[PDB]
Amino acid sequence: RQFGHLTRVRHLITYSLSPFEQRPFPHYFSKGVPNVWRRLRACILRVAPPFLAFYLLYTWGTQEFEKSKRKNPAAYVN
Amino acid sequence: RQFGHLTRVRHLITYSLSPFEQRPFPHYFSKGVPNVWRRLRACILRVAPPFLAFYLLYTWGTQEFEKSKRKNPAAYVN
Amino acid sequence: SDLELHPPSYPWSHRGPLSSLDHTSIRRGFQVYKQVCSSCHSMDYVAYRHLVGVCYTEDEAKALAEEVEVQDGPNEDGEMFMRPGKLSDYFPKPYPNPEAARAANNGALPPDLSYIVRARHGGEDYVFSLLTGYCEPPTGVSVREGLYFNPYFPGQAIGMAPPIYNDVLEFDDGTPATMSQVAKDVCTFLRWAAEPEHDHRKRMGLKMLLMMGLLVPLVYYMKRHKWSVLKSRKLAYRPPK
Amino acid sequence: SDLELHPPSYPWSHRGPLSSLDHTSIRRGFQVYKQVCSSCHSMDYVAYRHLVGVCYTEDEAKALAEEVEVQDGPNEDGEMFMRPGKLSDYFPKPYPNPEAARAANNGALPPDLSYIVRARHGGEDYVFSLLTGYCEPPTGVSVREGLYFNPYFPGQAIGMAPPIYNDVLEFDDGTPATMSQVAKDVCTFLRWAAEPEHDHRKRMGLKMLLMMGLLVPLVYYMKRHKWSVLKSRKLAYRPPK
Amino acid sequence: APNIRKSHPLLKMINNSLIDLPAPSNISAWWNFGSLLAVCLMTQILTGLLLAMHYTADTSLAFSSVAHTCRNVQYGWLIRNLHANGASFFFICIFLHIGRGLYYGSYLYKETWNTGVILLLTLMATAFVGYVLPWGQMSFWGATVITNLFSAIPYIGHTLVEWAWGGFSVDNPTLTRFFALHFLLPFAIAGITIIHLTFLHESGSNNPLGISSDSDKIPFHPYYSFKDILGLTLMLTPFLTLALFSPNLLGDPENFTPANPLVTPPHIKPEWYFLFAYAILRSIPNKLGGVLALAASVLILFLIPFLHKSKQRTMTFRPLSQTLFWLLVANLLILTWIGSQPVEHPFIIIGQMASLSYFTILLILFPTIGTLENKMLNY
Amino acid sequence: APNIRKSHPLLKMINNSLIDLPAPSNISAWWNFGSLLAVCLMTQILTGLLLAMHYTADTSLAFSSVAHTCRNVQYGWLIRNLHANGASFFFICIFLHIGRGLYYGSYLYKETWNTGVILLLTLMATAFVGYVLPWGQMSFWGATVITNLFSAIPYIGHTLVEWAWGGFSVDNPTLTRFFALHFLLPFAIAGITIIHLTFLHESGSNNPLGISSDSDKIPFHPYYSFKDILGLTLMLTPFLTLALFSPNLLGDPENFTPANPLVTPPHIKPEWYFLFAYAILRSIPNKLGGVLALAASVLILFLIPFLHKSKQRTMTFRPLSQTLFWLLVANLLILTWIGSQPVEHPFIIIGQMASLSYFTILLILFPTIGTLENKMLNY
Amino acid sequence: AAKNVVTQFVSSMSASADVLAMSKIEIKLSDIPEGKNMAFKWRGKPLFVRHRTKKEIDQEAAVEVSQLRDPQHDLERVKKPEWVILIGVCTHLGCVPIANAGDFGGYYCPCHGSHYDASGRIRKGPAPLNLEVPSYEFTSDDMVIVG
Ligand code: HEM
Ligand code: HEM
Ligand code: HEM
Ligand code: HEM
Ligand code: HEM
Ligand code: HEM
Ligand SMILES: CCCCCCCCO[C@@H]1O[C@H](CO)[C@@H](O)[C@H](O)[C@H]1O
Ligand SMILES: CCCCCCCCO[C@@H]1O[C@H](CO)[C@@H](O)[C@H](O)[C@H]1O
Ligand code: FES
């Protein structure tokens, strides 16, 4: 598929300025950084969980394995 | 380029028969072999020459080289 | 029991990402390799030639290869013969073949140290700990004839007897040859011997980091620049109603 | 003078495109290789194992490898030692190394005969002629100390003395061992030794020729068949005028 | 024609694939991996070729030919490193590439997705047979254990492995065919990679919001060319940092010991990018089923397109399955872990559990949470 | 769409290149060589790959690895033969392929013809570096003499050869890079071979009478597929007869002696398919010019399209140039001869004469007899 | 034609003449008298053939199979009583066991201490199984072929 036969579009007016008449990385604070946060706090509660969960299991696992090696002070009290 | 847009053709009528209603290698003598000859005798006189020529030169060359090795009965008659 | 003790972790002079090897120490190490290890441990991939320009002078190294003679190609009559080693010869092998060595070191086989530092987990930290670390086996544990207890070694029984005590050799640069100290240099050597690139590879790493630093922001600004025409764009719907 | 004499051309029993090697003769040859040539000429690529099923019985060949002992891998102490050759060993080398051989055959070096037959123009025709063909040098021509005139050999001076006269050995199959005759078998051997495929490669060539014979005419008839629709076709021009 | 860039039989191919090519405007950064994957390939083939020029494929010269290449061949060390580490950059990318597609339903473009699976299989094989080449303990032992697996295949089993490699065991006759295979496959990857992009180009490129992009596309070049080159550097910098500061960070030391058939190392395990499956392999005891689990762990990808139920393509507006998705990656991540560990108690369990939670999330949860998620939208 | 063979992104590629493809009806049998050339390639790459799986690229194992392949590897002997002899089938065809084009003016399709020249150059290189592999006397000496040629290139000369191969002389470090190069190039041939056919397909296929075929084309498959397969067997039978009855018919015996740097054979000459140029090489004494003559002996092909003057394309109806053409092949045939001979009197002359008659027939006669031939037709 | 060419190429992949050559091994029983353990090379690994005396034999046949980690009746592992044929590789980590040694008068692997009996059965050490017994048969009273 090429250009000129994608869709039946009507009544949309767009306005844009040359790259040289504007700023590249504008308003890092006014709108920039906020949205970055507007995002970290939007998925953290959806992504983090299973990862955190994984972690606990990784730890439990390693710790347990590393315990089942050491001897029990009482396997021989005689 | 595909089929259906090759050329502006008009007024040619062709007739052909299924492969099963005719003979494959027909009239080897009636027309077959003659034309083969009608051809050998049509280019022989155009192709053969330079090849024949080549040959002579090949022979001359090999023969001469093979002669310039042997001694001349008179390089020493003393 | 698959129970083991893991080496600590020393602040080697060459662990910094941008810190190279201390060649003065490398130089030393070479000496302890040559004067003590090289009698059991082969180092097939390094050769005198390498020392040149790194921890030894050309002539200096040339004379150091002479000290050893090597077996060389067929006669005019077809037989093996000896001769003073050149600069191009590789460090001598202590034994003609493995089985030959296994029989000289009571069964065990002293590994070639060419890549040792990277053939064991821990690298220098490991080797060091191992060298300066033998001691009597703990109670209940008994090592067999010919083996020597060393906690740092898996199984705690090494076919290798403590190879390094105070002195044993004398660093000529004028350095207090204490076991601990001597083992350090041997390790920094083993490092170099395993990856001579090291210093080169890092100076390079520096130069790469600075390019990434400079290159990405540029293309970032550039990417941001072309795009702006969209990021800033503004739609509007105007049906004639 | 780049002047040379070229071998004739004998009707070998194996020159036919469809004719294989005469194994009874091959068998013989092996013997002359083994009992006379093998004392100077190496044949590194063939091994007893090959004789099996071609000109010798398994057991027969097994016992033939025994006759020779071979040098084999390190001890339990690491040293080379000898032992009766097995079926998997390759024909013995007469000398430990080239220079060693050059010194036993007055400078010259007896080539390995593995591919000789195809390493020289003429092949068997050549080798044969060479073997049964020494004679006194013609007048004006003088060969130096240690070399032997042979017209068939470029330079006419071979470091090889006539290696084959009547008898010298005794074909056990019960065959009149005349120089000429013995040299024939040695040649048919050299052939096999150079390309063991031979017989297989030809029986195969036969089968291919018959397929080409059958396959092409079919596809020819088939090609001719589809096309006919054109070859036979008929045009006509009919403008309404 | 005027342009003379849209008329020429070859340029027209380029100006239609890297310029003038209609790409959606809202393409996410996750789409930067196809690019990377491709350049990742150019890179391997290069460094590899250049590295193959110093290698010898023979039991007695392999290990040292590589060593020599590093100690003697100018900048040889760097080239080896890049190639080795590159293998990983390659998989990390191919894994993020799969991901993006799995959760933007890119896979609905079946043909372009099926070839992609073939790309993964191929890229694997080439990387398995390629690690043997250096012929170190793991190279050898890895080859011997992993290849011998086919042995489970009943009947026509042993005879396959026994032919696969040399004759009776991973020895010289297999290092050679492996080297050859390694040299060949990458070019086949590139070949197929073309077919991949072809099928792709048939339809547009998918996008994050999963709804028709026709509404407003943008010329690839002016934009995406820049976009990707940015990604190239942003991802290539860590590659090099890793490649130049911790060269062996991801490489088993045991593979610095020339292969020796009389010393099987403890803990024989394939490269990390294979672990997840190595895990699911030793999850089921019956050797046969084990292979099947292994085979299915990857081949399942062919089924993904038939397990899509959402009335929506991507899962941007599908919070439920969204956690399912991350719960899944986490799962693979765990399998990886379990694979690097010994076959002992704390693990053995966590193993077959995770392994089980793998096939369920793909086979049964996803599709189910899928429809259920539809009812909730009144559909 | 209905057909479902003309709609599918991939089949459509095939059904448009081996079926439904418009081919002239009067295509001659000379057109059967493109086909052959292609299958000739598939064959090499196959046998080669399969043969590479038993080779070792190292001064000390090369020669015997090949020998071993023949004595030990099942059907190994056959595979080597086919591959070796195949090299020739390849050139014989590529030479008849050039021919046909030279005299049907097929070359007027510039782009499709220029790539073809690149195909020839490539196919050569791959065959030069490929003959060294067996490492026999000629393999070695041929490599040493032919490579050292660049030495003439002033200034940046010696340094090229001296880098080209290993370090100071054809030794191990070059056998490797040659082996690698040999393995790589064939795939590049196939790559380009695609571009070749692309450009071709742009226009139709030319034909013997050199006049528009549109008047009546025919579906490739029904016809030409059959036609070519016929050619395949008719030409493949001699290949095999030669390959199976006189395996060494075209192979120098001197190359059965393991390479030895202390014995330069007398009469060092490259394979027959190179001779013609080897001749034109030693035609001009000044070493430098010699290379140039050599380089120009092939590169001249790039100029052919600019030396066409006839108002007609083919030279069917051009009896004069027709003899010129055959007088030319005969000429190449002679150069071949001269090349296999020593550099001595009877030859040395015939050599530079033929060599001179080569560049004149292409550079000056042809174009001239061309226009003159036009006047005679009242043009 | 195709059937052939295809299969021919499908063999130039299979093990070659030089390999099949070391495929099978012939051993003379008579050159190995009772009491000693002989080591041979087969498929690149040591092949153990030991002639057993009353002491070695009987002491080995009496212990219970269900008491072993690798339950195996020696007489269900052998063809001839005076003959023991074993793969010279410990089942633990690929090492080589020693002749005339150990707590069980058979073989002992010094790498991690695996002890085997004169029947080749695992008794001491982590070794998961008994030494492996190669596929084989006998050729005569003094001849044996393994493989
Ligand atoms: C010289 C100071 C020296 C060094 C350095 C050294 C190192 C070394 C290492 C790291 C090992 C490998 C440990 C491992 O397997 O993980 C090792 C092993 C052996 N060595 Fe050693 N060694 C040094 C010197 C010597 C000397 C002087 C001898 C010979 C008298 C020697 C011998 C051995 C042997 C034997 C081993 C045992 C290996 C085993 O598996 O038991 N070493 N050494
Ligand atoms: C045994 C009957 C026998 C054969 C057969 C044989 C052949 C042979 C050939 C074909 C050559 C090569 C000729 C060439 O270079 O073109 C050759 C060369 C030498 N031989 Fe020989 N030879 C046979 C036997 C023997 C024997 C018994 C000896 C050693 C006592 C021997 C030696 C040599 C030597 C030396 C050469 C000379 C090579 C040279 O360049 O002069 N041969 N032989
Ligand atoms: C080495 C092989 C691969 C390369 C070089 C490759 C390359 C590409 C390229 C160039 C793109 C375009 C940009 C993008 O959308 O990311 C692409 C798209 C795609 N690839 Fe791959 N790919 C590879 C492997 C795979 C794999 C394994 C899969 C399948 C599991 C896959 C699935 C896709 C799909 C579905 C698209 C994306 C469509 C979209 O969402 O817009 N690719 N790939
Ligand atoms: C598809 C891209 C490729 C992948 C995924 C890949 C992967 C690998 C791997 C995993 C290694 C092992 C590195 C190590 O020893 O730690 C390797 C080695 C090797 N590869 Fe590749 N490779 C690829 C392409 C190539 C190609 C096409 C060549 C050259 C034609 C090549 C030649 C080699 C050689 C010679 C080695 C041995 C040297 C060495 O390992 O250092 N590789 N490759
Ligand atoms: C290995 C490389 C080559 C292959 C596989 C190849 C293949 C083909 C194919 C498939 C055809 C179509 C059938 C035909 O017209 O003969 C073709 C056409 C052509 N090739 Fe090649 N070609 C090769 C080398 C060359 C060379 C060296 C030249 C240039 C000097 C060349 C010039 C042409 C041209 C002009 C056409 C024929 C157009 C016509 O007369 O109809 N090709 N080639
Ligand atoms: C373009 C097609 C090819 C041509 C023109 C070609 C030509 C040759 C030549 C001239 C030889 C020498 C035969 C002899 O020793 O007399 C040869 C050898 C060899 N070629 Fe090729 N070759 C091609 C492709 C391949 C490929 C792609 C492979 C495998 C990947 C390959 C691998 C080898 C090997 C291993 C040898 C050495 C074994 C031998 O010479 O018998 N060849 N090739
Ligand atoms: C993509 C960013 C690439 C960064 C450039 C790589 C720089 C490599 O630079 C290298 O530095 C070494 C140390 O001085 C020199 O010895 C080498 O000759 C030089 O090539
Ligand atoms: C294109 C025509 C191909 C012809 C078929 C090739 C036949 C090869 O046939 C071969 O014949 C040998 C001799 O009996 C047998 O030993 C081989 O096993 C067999 O494959
Ligand atoms: S490897 Fe066998 S007991 Fe240790």
PDB file of N, CA, C and O in Angstrom, chain F residues 5 31 49-50 52 76 90 174 177-178 190 192 213 243 245 259 261 263 273 288 302 316 339 377:
ATOM      1  N   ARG F   5      -3.203 -17.773  -6.737  1.00  0.00           N
ATOM      2  CA  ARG F   5      -1.847 -18.115  -7.158  1.00  0.00           C
ATOM      3  C   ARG F   5      -1.243 -16.828  -7.706  1.00  0.00           C
ATOM      4  O   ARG F   5      -0.039 -16.725  -7.907  1.00  0.00           O
ATOM      5  N   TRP F  31      19.234 -19.736 -25.467  1.00  0.00           N
ATOM      6  CA  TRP F  31      18.663 -19.152 -24.269  1.00  0.00           C
ATOM      7  C   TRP F  31      18.584 -20.140 -23.082  1.00  0.00           C
ATOM      8  O   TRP F  31      18.255 -19.760 -21.951  1.00  0.00           O
ATOM      9  N   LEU F  49      28.894 -27.183  -0.072  1.00  0.00           N
ATOM     10  CA  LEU F  49      28.498 -27.156   1.327  1.00  0.00           C
ATOM     11  C   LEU F  49      28.775 -28.529   1.907  1.00  0.00           C
ATOM     12  O   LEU F  49      29.526 -28.691   2.858  1.00  0.00           O
ATOM     13  N   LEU F  50      28.178 -29.527   1.285  1.00  0.00           N
ATOM     14  CA  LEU F  50      28.326 -30.925   1.669  1.00  0.00           C
ATOM     15  C   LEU F  50      29.801 -31.392   1.692  1.00  0.00           C
ATOM     16  O   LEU F  50      30.180 -32.309   2.405  1.00  0.00           O
ATOM     17  N   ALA F  52      32.375 -29.066   2.140  1.00  0.00           N
ATOM     18  CA  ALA F  52      33.019 -28.229   3.134  1.00  0.00           C
ATOM     19  C   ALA F  52      32.882 -28.871   4.493  1.00  0.00           C
ATOM     20  O   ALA F  52      33.681 -28.641   5.373  1.00  0.00           O
ATOM     21  N   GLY F  76      32.035 -39.736  -0.926  1.00  0.00           N
ATOM     22  CA  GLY F  76      32.842 -38.541  -0.897  1.00  0.00           C
ATOM     23  C   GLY F  76      33.471 -38.328  -2.250  1.00  0.00           C
ATOM     24  O   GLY F  76      33.359 -37.242  -2.801  1.00  0.00           O
ATOM     25  N   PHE F  90      30.202 -25.067 -15.207  1.00  0.00           N
ATOM     26  CA  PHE F  90      29.814 -23.698 -14.915  1.00  0.00           C
ATOM     27  C   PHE F  90      30.400 -22.736 -15.914  1.00  0.00           C
ATOM     28  O   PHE F  90      29.652 -22.024 -16.568  1.00  0.00           O
ATOM     29  N   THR F 174      46.278 -17.365   4.657  1.00  0.00           N
ATOM     30  CA  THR F 174      45.601 -16.980   3.440  1.00  0.00           C
ATOM     31  C   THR F 174      44.711 -18.127   2.970  1.00  0.00           C
ATOM     32  O   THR F 174      43.695 -17.912   2.302  1.00  0.00           O
ATOM     33  N   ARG F 177      41.505 -17.333   4.931  1.00  0.00           N
ATOM     34  CA  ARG F 177      40.700 -16.286   4.311  1.00  0.00           C
ATOM     35  C   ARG F 177      40.234 -16.676   2.923  1.00  0.00           C
ATOM     36  O   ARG F 177      39.217 -16.175   2.452  1.00  0.00           O
ATOM     37  N   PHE F 178      40.969 -17.560   2.252  1.00  0.00           N
ATOM     38  CA  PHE F 178      40.534 -17.986   0.933  1.00  0.00           C
ATOM     39  C   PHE F 178      39.350 -18.903   1.157  1.00  0.00           C
ATOM     40  O   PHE F 178      38.289 -18.693   0.593  1.00  0.00           O
ATOM     41  N   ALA F 190      24.404 -15.839  -6.037  1.00  0.00           N
ATOM     42  CA  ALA F 190      22.963 -16.088  -6.002  1.00  0.00           C
ATOM     43  C   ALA F 190      22.218 -14.787  -5.718  1.00  0.00           C
ATOM     44  O   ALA F 190      21.207 -14.476  -6.352  1.00  0.00           O
ATOM     45  N   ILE F 192      23.096 -11.581  -6.288  1.00  0.00           N
ATOM     46  CA  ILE F 192      23.120 -10.812  -7.516  1.00  0.00           C
ATOM     47  C   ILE F 192      22.334 -11.475  -8.639  1.00  0.00           C
ATOM     48  O   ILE F 192      21.600 -10.810  -9.352  1.00  0.00           O
ATOM     49  N   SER F 213       8.832  -9.035 -29.899  1.00  0.00           N
ATOM     50  CA  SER F 213       8.165 -10.329 -29.697  1.00  0.00           C
ATOM     51  C   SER F 213       6.699 -10.213 -29.268  1.00  0.00           C
ATOM     52  O   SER F 213       5.951 -11.184 -29.346  1.00  0.00           O
ATOM     53  N   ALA F 243      32.675 -36.477 -15.791  1.00  0.00           N
ATOM     54  CA  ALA F 243      32.837 -36.635 -14.349  1.00  0.00           C
ATOM     55  C   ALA F 243      32.992 -38.077 -13.885  1.00  0.00           C
ATOM     56  O   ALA F 243      33.637 -38.342 -12.874  1.00  0.00           O
ATOM     57  N   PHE F 245      33.856 -40.824 -16.189  1.00  0.00           N
ATOM     58  CA  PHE F 245      34.795 -41.662 -16.917  1.00  0.00           C
ATOM     59  C   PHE F 245      36.206 -41.086 -16.976  1.00  0.00           C
ATOM     60  O   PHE F 245      37.162 -41.822 -16.782  1.00  0.00           O
ATOM     61  N   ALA F 259      51.464 -29.309  -1.588  1.00  0.00           N
ATOM     62  CA  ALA F 259      52.216 -28.088  -1.813  1.00  0.00           C
ATOM     63  C   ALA F 259      53.569 -28.126  -1.118  1.00  0.00           C
ATOM     64  O   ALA F 259      53.681 -28.567   0.015  1.00  0.00           O
ATOM     65  N   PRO F 261      56.928 -25.400  -1.001  1.00  0.00           N
ATOM     66  CA  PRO F 261      57.588 -24.136  -1.342  1.00  0.00           C
ATOM     67  C   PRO F 261      59.025 -24.216  -1.846  1.00  0.00           C
ATOM     68  O   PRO F 261      59.621 -23.195  -2.204  1.00  0.00           O
ATOM     69  N   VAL F 263      59.886 -26.396  -4.329  1.00  0.00           N
ATOM     70  CA  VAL F 263      59.839 -27.015  -5.638  1.00  0.00           C
ATOM     71  C   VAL F 263      58.820 -26.294  -6.492  1.00  0.00           C
ATOM     72  O   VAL F 263      57.637 -26.608  -6.425  1.00  0.00           O
ATOM     73  N   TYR F 273      39.753 -22.261 -17.915  1.00  0.00           N
ATOM     74  CA  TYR F 273      38.826 -21.142 -18.046  1.00  0.00           C
ATOM     75  C   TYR F 273      39.414 -19.785 -17.716  1.00  0.00           C
ATOM     76  O   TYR F 273      38.701 -18.793 -17.760  1.00  0.00           O
ATOM     77  N   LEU F 288      53.607  -4.061 -15.708  1.00  0.00           N
ATOM     78  CA  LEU F 288      52.424  -3.253 -15.420  1.00  0.00           C
ATOM     79  C   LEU F 288      51.394  -3.418 -16.522  1.00  0.00           C
ATOM     80  O   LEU F 288      50.337  -3.995 -16.303  1.00  0.00           O
ATOM     81  N   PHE F 302      32.214  -4.377 -20.370  1.00  0.00           N
ATOM     82  CA  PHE F 302      31.412  -3.234 -19.964  1.00  0.00           C
ATOM     83  C   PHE F 302      31.239  -2.233 -21.103  1.00  0.00           C
ATOM     84  O   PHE F 302      30.266  -1.480 -21.130  1.00  0.00           O
ATOM     85  N   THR F 316      21.740 -11.665 -37.186  1.00  0.00           N
ATOM     86  CA  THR F 316      21.247 -12.770 -37.952  1.00  0.00           C
ATOM     87  C   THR F 316      21.375 -12.352 -39.404  1.00  0.00           C
ATOM     88  O   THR F 316      21.930 -13.076 -40.218  1.00  0.00           O
ATOM     89  N   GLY F 339      48.003 -19.940 -24.141  1.00  0.00           N
ATOM     90  CA  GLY F 339      48.214 -19.868 -22.706  1.00  0.00           C
ATOM     91  C   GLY F 339      48.730 -21.131 -22.032  1.00  0.00           C
ATOM     92  O   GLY F 339      49.460 -21.064 -21.055  1.00  0.00           O
ATOM     93  N   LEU F 377      22.986  -1.089 -46.658  1.00  0.00           N
ATOM     94  CA  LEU F 377      21.545  -1.308 -46.625  1.00  0.00           C
ATOM     95  C   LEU F 377      20.785  -0.033 -46.961  1.00  0.00           C
ATOM     96  O   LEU F 377      19.566   0.012 -46.890  1.00  0.00           O
TER      97      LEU F 377
END
